[PDB]
Amino acid sequence: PSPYIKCCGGAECSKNEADYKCSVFTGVYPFMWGGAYCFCDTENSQMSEVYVTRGESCEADAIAYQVTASLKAQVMISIGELNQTVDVFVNGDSPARIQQSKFILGPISSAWSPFDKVIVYRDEVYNEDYAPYGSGQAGRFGDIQSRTVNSTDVYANTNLKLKRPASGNVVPYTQTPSGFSYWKKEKGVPLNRNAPFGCIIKVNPVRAENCVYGNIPISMDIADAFTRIDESPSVSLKACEVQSCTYSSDFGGVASISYTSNKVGKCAISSNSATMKDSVQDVQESGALSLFFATSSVEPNFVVQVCNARITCGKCEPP
Amino acid sequence: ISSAWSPFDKVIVYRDEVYNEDYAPYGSGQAGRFGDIQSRTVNSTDVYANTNL
Amino acid sequence: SVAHFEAYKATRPYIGWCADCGLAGSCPSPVSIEHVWSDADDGVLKIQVSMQIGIAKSNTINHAKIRYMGANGVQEAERSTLSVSTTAPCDILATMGHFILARCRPGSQVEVSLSTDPKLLCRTPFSHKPRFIGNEKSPAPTGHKTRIPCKTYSHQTDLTREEITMHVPPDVPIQGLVSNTGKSYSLDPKTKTIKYKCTCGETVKEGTATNKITLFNCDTAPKCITYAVDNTVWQYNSQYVPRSEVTEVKGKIHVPFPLTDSTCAVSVAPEPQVTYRLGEVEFHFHPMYPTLFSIRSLGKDPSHSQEWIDTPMSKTIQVGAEGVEYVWGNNNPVRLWAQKSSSSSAHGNPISIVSHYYDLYPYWTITVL
Amino acid sequence: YESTTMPNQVGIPFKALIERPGYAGLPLSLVVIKSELVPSLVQDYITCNYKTVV
């Protein structure tokens, strides 16, 4: 506030607010300008004052969080007749029923999570640590501490230099910008590329996508009897053709498997000693099948089965 | 602080008296377990639970 | 207050100290910049001034008129020219009463001026530094390529929506009005009611004067204090307005232009040309006006460096089995994998070996040992 | 100038008067009335008994 004058001897501030600084200059307005508004001019006092108020920029600019993350999966389940993916938590045991066959999604072993002591501005999530109760001070993150968003009172630290007037003009004062305003520019460094081994942290969902870590035990009691045999063709003339061989390994395997069969039926192939395109699969006589793989770079060896019968490939590796 | 400590952990605070109980959240599936009913929306009747009838 | 009519009346307009009156000379100016606040990322300046724009003195609305009060008391003036100027011209986004919205250029000072009828100006230091959003501009910018989040001060005017306080009972600044003419004291009222407290006076030495009187045995200053004041005035602080009262009272005023989120349309530079090698990716930067670039990773290491790429250069960044991400300007991330000659069938063996006929990665140089 | 480590014992009167060189008056006596552990929790879930419906 600009000056409030108190005639012929004032007293100090005993107005209060969220944060306040107050100085009482005495003997002021020595020649005045007719802004004395008093008899006195030789013994007048000016109570100069300043206070803090909290802005409207308390939306999320900025909120300090201590996170421990809860674990969510998006597993896609295909029974071969209902094709759905379902978002479901993986903390311990998680029973889910689809056609009254039991599945239990087990816990994922996380190496680390990107969400720690982080600072979130509303411009962008940012990876940045703080020290607790580190705001309200200079030289450390922040310069203002408010305990909750609704709280209208704040502990704030700002610098102002008030002086007395000494001229025929009317007040000297020099005023520096706010502490928070200095940090607004600085930000942090992006929270979008932190953590090794996947983890893309996107600002709007406030979460981290495509995080490859550990092994997931899975257990199911599923009805596959039915009537056993569910048809098992015996198989002959087992061959491996390998073609389309061109260097790289960030894409999937391309093998073709030739065989000939003596019956039509359905096996569930393939297993994990190799990777098929089709898991519900009609095996027929003279069944040459170009099929897609996707483990042939973690495990370049592959023991491809068509039912009972099987052989080993590949044959393409750097010469 | 030189060092800081609270005897609190995983606690379930009854209005009768605070009691120290262990649990694993989202782990319902079975008729036991402390805090089998889990509710997070207080605007909706949904609860995750396992019960027997 | 409740509304625009009522707000403006109850907290009367006022004159304040402005230390620029021509770009030099310190005087009471009726235009005085109270505060400039910026909480917009659209570069908007919410300037607070002491004139009230869009209302007349009769308490009715004319956009042609504006109402100010200074040492001639409360007057109407015509408006047909209004400008703000940093160190270079500005465009006014919106104006409602006390408050002005403007988009200006960089400058060390901010000038609120007119020339229609007030014929004055007030220029006060307020820092407004460069605003560059996007990564491109163009003659008469309007380009679009990407929407970015920003914060802004509304275009619409609110009749009520938040408050700020005004305070201190009527005390309206004057710079001198009383003088010792001859060897007697000549009381000038001017064109306003004047309250003075006088140690002595033959007729008047306490009263509301609006006539000319001569008082003998009287002299200016520590023993005869005159100031013009008229009622129902709460003013907000200026910079160097002094004021004294014997009682303490307040007034309130409404705040149009609240802070609200928006999205702005800006162009950034289209993607630079890429050249490809066996398992490695090279960016050759094209000529464009400065683009900020990130080179990052999250696939294998968290690693990140930043630079402004202002000039054509080739940079080689390596891409392993896991992705590599290049962020170029304000655009969304492109992710890139290893491109050699494409595909796999079985490449490599479980006992580890490396691509083509190289000796690096070490799997051939172990052999040499 | 400053600076001690007191133990936290309720009701003990601790006397600190370490100040600049020169005799320094107006000592600090400090008694601890209580420490108040102010919780910094995350709510895991809310649970209460239920109304069964046929």
XYZ file of N, CA, C and O in Angstrom, chain A residues 1-7 15 29 31-42 44 49 51 55-57 59 61 122-124 164-173 184-185 189-190 192-202 212 242-255 296-302 313-319, chain C residues 17 26 28 37 39 41 46 149-151 153 165 167-169 171-176 197-199 221-227 236-248 258-262 296-304 306 319-323 325 333 335 337-350 353-357:
688
model
N 0.828 -1.151 0.000
C 0.000 0.000 0.000
C 0.872 1.212 0.000
O 1.893 1.272 0.621
N 0.356 2.218 -0.721
C 1.026 3.529 -0.563
C 0.810 4.003 0.897
O -0.181 3.549 1.530
N 1.712 4.923 1.393
C 1.585 5.476 2.656
C 0.246 5.857 3.248
O -0.530 6.566 2.585
N 0.044 5.613 4.575
C -1.047 6.106 5.508
C -0.310 6.915 6.522
O 0.721 6.441 7.017
N -0.756 8.128 6.802
C -0.150 9.035 7.635
C -1.035 9.112 8.830
O -2.227 8.759 8.735
N -0.376 9.463 9.963
C -0.923 9.567 11.300
C -0.311 10.793 11.768
O 0.899 10.908 11.661
N -1.126 11.667 12.212
C -0.711 12.991 12.535
C -0.003 13.114 13.882
O -0.518 12.506 14.782
N -2.203 -3.701 12.547
C -2.710 -4.508 11.428
C -1.817 -5.736 11.191
O -0.580 -5.575 11.241
N 7.943 14.226 5.776
C 7.407 15.256 4.940
C 8.005 16.653 5.306
O 7.211 17.428 5.852
N 9.294 19.394 3.960
C 8.994 20.566 3.184
C 7.588 20.386 2.686
O 6.895 21.295 2.289
N 7.105 19.120 2.690
C 5.853 18.549 2.229
C 5.538 19.017 0.792
O 6.433 19.388 0.013
N 4.254 18.849 0.305
C 3.783 19.083 -1.065
C 2.321 19.357 -0.853
O 1.596 19.370 -1.789
N 1.861 19.537 0.391
C 0.522 19.670 0.797
C -0.071 18.325 0.914
O -1.323 18.265 0.950
N 0.742 17.178 0.924
C 0.266 15.835 1.241
C 0.527 15.436 2.666
O 0.436 14.312 3.079
N 0.939 16.454 3.453
C 1.057 16.315 4.890
C -0.310 15.970 5.573
O -0.548 14.953 6.255
N -1.321 16.816 5.221
C -2.751 16.791 5.672
C -2.852 16.844 7.281
O -3.683 16.211 7.876
N -1.958 17.648 7.841
C -1.768 17.736 9.195
C -1.253 19.108 9.492
O -0.578 19.730 8.677
N -1.395 19.492 10.783
C -0.688 20.612 11.334
C 0.795 20.351 11.297
O 1.613 21.052 10.739
N 1.198 19.195 11.827
C 2.637 18.784 11.868
C 3.246 18.493 10.508
O 2.691 18.108 9.513
N 4.608 18.672 10.499
C 5.463 18.677 9.358
C 6.824 18.496 9.937
O 7.820 18.438 9.203
N 6.995 18.572 11.248
C 8.258 18.669 11.897
C 8.280 17.463 12.759
O 9.317 16.997 13.212
N 5.583 14.687 12.134
C 4.641 13.708 11.522
C 5.332 12.342 11.390
O 6.574 12.248 11.352
N 3.559 0.188 5.069
C 3.031 -1.133 5.197
C 3.036 -1.796 3.891
O 2.962 -1.216 2.823
N 1.901 -6.284 2.815
C 1.383 -7.570 3.189
C 1.287 -8.448 1.946
O 1.372 -8.032 0.827
N -2.399 -15.684 -4.544
C -2.862 -15.521 -5.943
C -3.796 -16.605 -6.303
O -4.212 -17.399 -5.446
N -4.130 -16.600 -7.609
C -5.092 -17.438 -8.251
C -4.411 -18.423 -9.081
O -4.983 -19.051 -9.985
N -3.060 -18.530 -8.887
C -2.116 -19.346 -9.708
C -1.705 -20.549 -8.896
O -0.619 -21.091 -9.047
N -3.369 -23.469 -8.939
C -4.106 -24.481 -9.608
C -3.422 -25.837 -9.630
O -4.027 -26.890 -9.395
N 0.463 -25.128 -9.890
C 1.638 -24.499 -10.381
C 2.376 -24.019 -9.129
O 2.631 -22.841 -8.947
N 1.726 -27.158 -13.913
C 0.655 -27.539 -14.750
C 1.009 -27.483 -16.246
O 0.337 -27.998 -17.147
N 2.191 -26.854 -16.490
C 2.763 -26.898 -17.808
C 3.114 -28.336 -18.186
O 3.095 -28.588 -19.392
N 3.617 -29.173 -17.231
C 4.285 -30.368 -17.574
C 4.714 -30.938 -16.245
O 5.132 -30.228 -15.311
N 12.131 7.074 3.596
C 11.370 8.281 3.999
C 11.501 9.295 2.863
O 12.415 9.190 2.014
N 10.598 10.217 2.762
C 10.599 11.242 1.743
C 11.446 12.404 2.296
O 11.602 12.450 3.517
N 12.010 13.172 1.420
C 12.919 14.185 1.839
C 12.974 15.370 0.884
O 14.010 16.018 0.749
N 11.901 15.540 0.141
C 11.840 16.437 -0.948
C 10.510 17.058 -1.053
O 9.632 16.691 -0.292
N 10.355 17.989 -1.982
C 9.120 18.670 -2.247
C 8.134 17.882 -3.112
O 7.043 18.402 -3.502
N 8.489 16.660 -3.511
C 7.726 15.765 -4.354
C 7.174 14.746 -3.333
O 7.632 14.696 -2.210
N 6.106 13.974 -3.729
C 5.726 12.865 -2.924
C 6.077 11.452 -3.632
O 5.452 11.619 -4.712
N 7.416 9.268 -2.772
C 7.955 8.503 -1.601
C 9.054 7.698 -2.285
O 8.754 7.095 -3.264
N 10.277 7.552 -1.739
C 11.191 6.620 -2.367
C 10.983 5.211 -1.847
O 10.895 5.017 -0.644
N 10.958 4.206 -2.841
C 10.928 2.822 -2.551
C 11.348 2.088 -3.779
O 11.046 2.508 -4.899
N 9.424 -19.890 -11.500
C 8.420 -20.273 -12.488
C 9.168 -20.574 -13.805
O 8.767 -21.454 -14.544
N 10.194 -19.757 -14.141
C 11.029 -19.854 -15.299
C 11.878 -21.098 -15.316
O 12.003 -21.756 -16.324
N 13.358 -30.729 -14.999
C 13.655 -31.436 -16.273
C 12.568 -32.495 -16.492
O 11.942 -32.916 -15.514
N 12.191 -32.783 -17.713
C 10.868 -33.362 -17.999
C 10.683 -34.653 -17.335
O 11.644 -35.457 -17.352
N 9.187 -37.556 -18.519
C 8.562 -38.117 -19.695
C 9.595 -39.138 -20.308
O 9.250 -39.687 -21.331
N 10.868 -39.217 -19.729
C 11.932 -39.969 -20.341
C 12.768 -40.544 -19.292
O 13.591 -41.404 -19.520
N 12.393 -40.211 -18.016
C 13.013 -40.815 -16.824
C 12.473 -42.221 -16.728
O 11.451 -42.656 -17.282
N 13.359 -43.067 -15.990
C 13.396 -44.517 -15.612
C 13.937 -45.356 -16.740
O 13.531 -45.017 -17.863
N 14.791 -46.309 -16.597
C 15.297 -47.076 -17.687
C 14.373 -48.278 -17.818
O 13.646 -48.603 -16.864
N 14.336 -48.996 -18.939
C 13.517 -50.138 -19.147
C 11.981 -49.806 -19.328
O 11.219 -49.981 -18.368
N 11.622 -49.142 -20.405
C 10.361 -48.551 -20.748
C 10.034 -47.353 -19.889
O 10.892 -46.764 -19.308
N 8.733 -47.043 -19.802
C 8.215 -45.964 -18.912
C 8.260 -44.725 -19.691
O 9.310 -44.160 -19.850
N 7.102 -44.300 -20.223
C 6.791 -43.106 -20.893
C 5.816 -42.493 -20.021
O 4.752 -43.028 -19.855
N 6.120 -41.320 -19.388
C 5.238 -40.684 -18.448
C 4.535 -39.461 -19.125
O 5.194 -38.586 -19.672
N 3.205 -39.513 -19.211
C 2.507 -38.603 -20.008
C 1.716 -37.857 -19.032
O 1.266 -38.319 -17.985
N 8.364 -52.539 -18.821
C 8.827 -53.905 -18.885
C 9.807 -54.081 -17.686
O 10.760 -53.336 -17.455
N 13.352 -71.308 -44.032
C 13.672 -70.022 -43.453
C 14.018 -69.120 -44.629
O 14.787 -69.601 -45.462
N 13.272 -67.992 -44.727
C 13.356 -67.070 -45.888
C 12.910 -65.710 -45.370
O 12.281 -65.543 -44.386
N 13.334 -64.670 -46.224
C 13.007 -63.345 -45.850
C 14.105 -62.912 -44.815
O 13.848 -62.252 -43.819
N 15.387 -63.292 -44.968
C 16.419 -63.109 -43.992
C 17.162 -61.887 -44.341
O 17.756 -61.751 -45.419
N 17.034 -60.888 -43.455
C 17.569 -59.580 -43.626
C 17.741 -59.171 -42.281
O 17.041 -59.493 -41.306
N 18.838 -58.484 -42.063
C 19.401 -58.113 -40.731
C 18.540 -57.075 -40.100
O 18.079 -56.095 -40.798
N 18.448 -57.160 -38.739
C 17.720 -56.338 -37.753
C 17.189 -57.359 -36.813
O 17.428 -58.540 -36.976
N 16.502 -56.955 -35.685
C 16.105 -57.874 -34.642
C 15.113 -57.115 -33.791
O 14.689 -57.695 -32.805
N 14.740 -55.870 -34.173
C 13.715 -55.129 -33.436
C 12.406 -55.400 -34.123
O 11.374 -54.854 -33.756
N 12.344 -56.359 -35.108
C 11.089 -56.831 -35.593
C 11.066 -58.346 -35.422
O 12.081 -59.029 -35.234
N 9.832 -58.924 -35.611
C 9.528 -60.326 -35.425
C 10.065 -61.291 -36.494
O 10.586 -60.889 -37.522
N 9.980 -62.605 -36.109
C 10.501 -63.681 -36.870
C 9.581 -64.049 -37.870
O 8.359 -63.961 -37.676
N 10.138 -64.551 -38.997
C 9.354 -64.980 -40.150
C 9.985 -66.290 -40.486
O 11.066 -66.335 -41.133
N 9.273 -67.407 -40.211
C 9.644 -68.809 -40.510
C 8.378 -69.377 -41.197
O 7.297 -68.746 -41.165
N 12.222 -64.827 -31.121
C 13.141 -65.537 -32.094
C 14.301 -64.631 -32.053
O 15.234 -64.721 -32.902
N 14.323 -63.691 -31.073
C 15.452 -62.737 -30.852
C 15.858 -62.730 -29.399
O 17.017 -62.422 -29.088
N 14.866 -63.055 -28.442
C 15.231 -63.269 -27.025
C 15.889 -64.619 -26.967
O 16.976 -64.759 -26.448
N 15.228 -65.590 -27.728
C 15.578 -66.981 -27.937
C 15.593 -67.221 -29.395
O 14.556 -67.601 -29.923
N 16.704 -67.016 -30.085
C 16.857 -67.379 -31.445
C 16.660 -68.831 -31.751
O 16.191 -68.993 -32.852
N 16.981 -69.801 -30.834
C 16.615 -71.136 -31.108
C 15.085 -71.314 -31.029
O 14.492 -70.765 -30.168
N 14.477 -72.107 -31.849
C 13.044 -72.398 -31.745
C 12.730 -73.803 -32.185
O 13.097 -74.211 -33.286
N 14.985 -75.011 -35.587
C 15.432 -73.981 -36.560
C 15.954 -72.844 -35.679
O 15.642 -72.869 -34.451
N 16.695 -71.804 -36.157
C 16.664 -71.206 -37.506
C 17.923 -71.628 -38.226
O 18.330 -72.813 -38.067
N 18.473 -70.752 -39.111
C 19.630 -71.089 -39.876
C 20.308 -69.877 -40.386
O 21.305 -70.042 -41.111
N 19.640 -68.745 -40.134
C 19.989 -67.402 -40.507
C 20.480 -66.771 -39.281
O 19.691 -66.458 -38.378
N 21.774 -66.456 -39.154
C 22.487 -65.742 -38.121
C 23.699 -65.180 -38.863
O 24.022 -65.633 -39.939
N 24.311 -64.081 -38.305
C 25.320 -63.256 -39.070
C 26.427 -64.201 -39.528
O 26.898 -65.010 -38.691
N 26.889 -64.244 -40.749
C 28.027 -65.163 -41.083
C 29.297 -64.330 -40.934
O 29.271 -63.101 -40.862
N 0.186 9.658 -8.269
C 1.529 10.118 -8.598
C 1.947 9.286 -9.795
O 1.810 8.075 -9.816
N 7.739 14.782 -13.314
C 7.045 14.032 -12.284
C 5.917 14.985 -11.885
O 6.145 16.158 -11.673
N 1.327 14.743 -10.567
C 0.094 13.995 -10.481
C -0.438 13.921 -11.846
O -0.768 14.943 -12.443
N 0.296 -7.052 -13.625
C 0.385 -8.476 -13.213
C 0.321 -9.422 -14.460
O -0.484 -9.077 -15.283
N -0.085 -13.481 -15.400
C -0.354 -14.795 -14.945
C -0.836 -15.585 -16.112
O -1.334 -16.715 -15.983
N 0.198 -17.070 -20.058
C 1.276 -17.606 -20.820
C 0.948 -17.253 -22.269
O 1.535 -17.746 -23.167
N -2.167 -7.527 -17.480
C -3.355 -7.069 -16.822
C -2.806 -5.877 -16.130
O -2.071 -6.039 -15.166
N -0.935 -26.024 -24.425
C -1.646 -25.544 -23.272
C -1.060 -24.235 -22.873
O 0.172 -24.055 -22.853
N -1.987 -23.329 -22.475
C -1.524 -22.084 -21.965
C -2.566 -21.667 -20.995
O -3.688 -22.132 -21.003
N -2.180 -20.569 -20.283
C -3.067 -19.961 -19.332
C -3.227 -18.510 -19.883
O -2.413 -18.016 -20.664
N -5.896 -14.592 -19.412
C -6.883 -13.753 -18.742
C -8.015 -13.547 -19.815
O -7.718 -13.081 -20.933
N -9.615 -5.384 -2.717
C -9.932 -4.332 -1.746
C -9.378 -2.954 -2.230
O -8.402 -2.905 -2.950
N -9.341 1.123 -0.053
C -9.277 1.433 1.361
C -8.749 2.844 1.515
O -8.214 3.456 0.556
N -8.907 3.373 2.770
C -8.605 4.713 3.305
C -9.749 5.737 2.908
O -9.914 5.999 1.698
N -10.693 6.159 3.802
C -11.687 7.267 3.673
C -11.281 8.429 2.829
O -10.064 8.660 2.854
N -9.580 11.241 0.594
C -8.429 12.029 0.721
C -7.970 11.963 -0.728
O -7.393 10.967 -1.187
N -8.201 13.074 -1.456
C -7.892 13.220 -2.888
C -6.800 14.138 -3.119
O -6.809 15.386 -2.834
N -5.612 13.676 -3.607
C -4.405 14.426 -3.827
C -4.538 15.662 -4.637
O -5.233 15.772 -5.653
N -3.835 16.779 -4.169
C -3.529 18.112 -4.621
C -2.026 18.323 -4.390
O -1.447 17.713 -3.512
N -1.451 19.244 -5.118
C -0.028 19.471 -5.300
C 0.219 20.898 -4.883
O 1.343 21.369 -4.997
N -0.766 21.613 -4.346
C -0.488 23.013 -4.054
C -1.566 23.779 -4.662
O -2.050 23.549 -5.776
N -7.649 23.105 8.031
C -7.639 23.296 9.455
C -6.538 24.385 9.503
O -5.448 24.235 8.968
N -6.908 25.518 10.148
C -6.128 26.729 10.259
C -5.945 27.062 11.721
O -6.886 26.919 12.454
N -4.698 27.399 12.102
C -4.454 27.886 13.485
C -5.217 29.166 13.708
O -5.718 29.397 14.796
N 1.500 26.747 5.887
C 2.011 25.375 5.710
C 1.891 24.615 7.028
O 1.193 23.642 7.127
N 2.551 25.069 8.113
C 2.555 24.149 9.318
C 1.552 24.680 10.277
O 1.565 24.303 11.447
N 0.753 25.563 9.786
C -0.141 26.276 10.636
C -1.356 26.711 9.820
O -2.284 27.287 10.372
N -1.381 26.254 8.487
C -2.606 26.324 7.664
C -2.448 25.340 6.584
O -1.604 25.483 5.719
N -3.254 24.185 6.752
C -3.212 23.049 5.830
C -4.497 22.837 5.013
O -5.520 22.395 5.528
N -4.456 22.987 3.665
C -5.605 22.953 2.845
C -5.381 21.821 1.881
O -4.326 21.660 1.377
N -6.477 21.031 1.589
C -6.573 20.028 0.611
C -8.049 19.948 0.177
O -8.927 19.988 1.032
N -7.451 2.530 -4.482
C -6.516 1.414 -4.381
C -5.213 2.167 -4.430
O -5.202 3.363 -4.766
N -4.125 1.531 -4.001
C -2.748 2.147 -3.920
C -2.284 2.343 -5.328
O -2.630 1.656 -6.311
N -1.355 3.352 -5.423
C -0.785 3.811 -6.683
C 0.671 3.380 -6.491
O 1.021 2.266 -6.840
N 1.515 4.310 -6.036
C 2.992 4.139 -5.895
C 3.453 5.169 -4.846
O 4.292 4.768 -4.054
N 2.896 6.426 -4.811
C 3.477 7.559 -4.083
C 2.325 8.499 -3.888
O 2.501 9.698 -3.948
N 1.119 8.020 -3.534
C -0.018 8.803 -3.041
C 0.041 8.861 -1.489
O 0.064 7.806 -0.933
N 0.126 9.996 -0.774
C 0.141 10.043 0.641
C -1.279 10.384 0.980
O -1.985 10.948 0.157
N -1.731 9.946 2.221
C -3.071 10.087 2.606
C -3.068 9.968 4.142
O -2.180 9.328 4.685
N -3.950 10.641 4.841
C -4.027 10.725 6.270
C -5.528 10.668 6.510
O -6.248 11.335 5.789
N -5.896 9.949 7.569
C -7.271 9.990 7.990
C -7.274 9.829 9.447
O -6.327 9.375 10.104
N -8.479 10.161 10.080
C -8.674 10.041 11.484
C -9.483 8.820 11.748
O -9.535 8.383 12.886
N -10.137 8.206 10.699
C -10.948 7.031 10.852
C -10.443 6.141 9.711
O -9.743 6.570 8.811
N -10.861 4.810 9.763
C -10.356 3.820 8.845
C -11.560 3.086 8.375
O -12.268 2.505 9.161
N -10.775 -13.118 -15.248
C -10.164 -14.043 -14.367
C -9.201 -14.906 -15.158
O -9.331 -15.000 -16.365
N -8.298 -15.554 -14.530
C -7.375 -16.516 -15.049
C -8.085 -17.765 -15.442
O -8.825 -18.322 -14.644
N -7.852 -18.183 -16.710
C -8.498 -19.346 -17.146
C -7.591 -19.969 -18.204
O -6.879 -19.294 -18.964
N -7.563 -21.304 -18.297
C -6.873 -22.092 -19.273
C -7.468 -21.945 -20.594
O -8.649 -21.679 -20.736
N -6.650 -22.033 -21.673
C -6.972 -21.949 -23.063
C -5.941 -22.850 -23.649
O -5.173 -23.589 -22.969
N 16.547 -37.880 -26.418
C 16.290 -38.595 -25.227
C 16.159 -39.994 -25.528
O 16.345 -40.445 -26.626
N 15.883 -40.662 -24.400
C 15.915 -42.123 -24.280
C 15.080 -42.415 -23.078
O 14.957 -41.517 -22.267
N 14.517 -43.645 -22.916
C 13.779 -44.152 -21.748
C 13.752 -45.639 -21.884
O 13.195 -46.289 -21.011
N 14.280 -46.085 -23.007
C 14.339 -47.461 -23.416
C 15.378 -48.264 -22.697
O 15.172 -49.420 -22.408
N 16.583 -47.699 -22.483
C 17.725 -48.469 -22.012
C 18.418 -47.667 -20.907
O 19.095 -48.225 -19.982
N 18.360 -46.291 -20.927
C 18.958 -45.380 -19.986
C 17.962 -44.280 -19.993
O 17.250 -44.053 -20.929
N 17.925 -43.435 -18.949
C 16.851 -42.393 -18.783
C 17.247 -41.150 -19.599
O 16.399 -40.304 -19.810
N 18.639 -40.970 -19.873
C 19.485 -39.897 -20.477
C 18.805 -38.852 -21.310
O 17.890 -39.077 -22.088
N 19.238 -37.617 -21.126
C 18.685 -36.437 -21.799
C 19.652 -35.279 -21.869
O 20.157 -34.814 -20.831
N 19.824 -31.238 -24.268
C 18.989 -30.251 -24.894
C 19.957 -29.297 -25.570
O 21.007 -28.864 -25.020
N 20.727 -46.094 -31.886
C 19.471 -46.671 -31.562
C 19.721 -48.115 -31.398
O 20.035 -48.784 -32.348
N 19.527 -48.645 -30.152
C 19.760 -50.068 -29.861
C 18.565 -50.892 -30.093
O 17.858 -50.695 -31.078
N 18.287 -51.851 -29.243
C 17.182 -52.818 -29.463
C 15.913 -52.142 -29.048
O 14.837 -52.252 -29.587
N 15.995 -51.297 -27.983
C 14.989 -50.515 -27.385
C 14.918 -49.240 -28.160
O 15.912 -48.859 -28.884
N 13.777 -48.537 -28.108
C 13.556 -47.274 -28.802
C 14.447 -46.100 -28.402
O 15.056 -46.068 -27.345
N 13.995 -41.676 -28.772
C 12.980 -40.770 -28.999
C 13.577 -39.392 -29.289
O 14.418 -38.860 -28.544
N 6.296 -36.817 -29.545
C 7.537 -37.577 -29.800
C 7.369 -38.589 -30.923
O 6.315 -39.256 -30.946
N 9.218 -42.057 -32.134
C 9.992 -43.137 -31.647
C 10.479 -43.926 -32.744
O 9.789 -44.103 -33.711
N 13.249 -47.286 -33.964
C 13.756 -48.558 -33.633
C 14.998 -48.762 -34.495
O 15.442 -47.812 -35.112
N 15.571 -49.948 -34.537
C 16.728 -50.178 -35.274
C 16.339 -50.606 -36.641
O 15.600 -51.560 -36.784
N 16.910 -49.856 -37.599
C 16.787 -50.057 -39.054
C 18.182 -50.273 -39.596
O 19.070 -49.460 -39.470
N 18.258 -51.517 -40.235
C 19.513 -52.000 -40.795
C 19.132 -52.303 -42.231
O 19.627 -51.652 -43.140
N 18.333 -53.269 -42.449
C 17.836 -53.662 -43.699
C 16.586 -54.404 -43.469
O 15.970 -54.952 -44.343
N 16.065 -54.322 -42.167
C 14.751 -54.770 -41.849
C 14.699 -56.184 -41.550
O 15.485 -56.957 -42.100
N 13.717 -56.584 -40.675
C 13.358 -57.901 -40.349
C 14.380 -58.731 -39.590
O 15.511 -58.244 -39.448
N 13.873 -59.919 -39.141
C 14.516 -60.983 -38.425
C 13.771 -62.245 -38.774
O 12.599 -62.209 -39.172
N 14.460 -63.412 -38.540
C 13.912 -64.708 -38.787
C 14.489 -65.500 -37.685
O 13.896 -66.459 -37.190
N 15.699 -65.164 -37.227
C 16.395 -66.108 -36.344
C 17.715 -65.464 -36.008
O 18.565 -66.198 -35.447
N 18.036 -64.166 -36.390
C 19.320 -63.559 -36.368
C 19.782 -63.596 -34.989
O 19.036 -63.262 -34.096
N 21.067 -63.987 -34.815
C 21.802 -64.168 -33.619
C 21.599 -65.557 -33.209
O 20.900 -66.396 -33.823
N 22.269 -65.945 -32.112
C 22.338 -67.353 -31.660
C 22.229 -67.127 -30.130
O 22.443 -65.984 -29.629
N 21.827 -68.115 -29.325
C 21.715 -67.851 -27.799
C 23.007 -67.466 -27.086
O 22.961 -66.549 -26.243
N 26.537 -63.025 -30.208
C 27.259 -62.782 -31.399
C 26.715 -61.408 -31.890
O 25.632 -61.022 -31.404
N 27.419 -60.665 -32.909
C 27.028 -59.412 -33.381
C 26.882 -59.364 -34.927
O 27.422 -60.136 -35.697
N 26.069 -58.315 -35.318
C 25.566 -58.059 -36.697
C 26.624 -57.927 -37.830
O 27.615 -57.285 -37.581
N 26.392 -58.418 -39.032
C 27.289 -58.288 -40.163
C 28.614 -58.972 -39.918
O 28.679 -60.089 -39.417
N 29.756 -58.376 -40.353
C 31.009 -59.113 -40.198
C 31.882 -58.286 -39.375
O 33.094 -58.382 -39.428
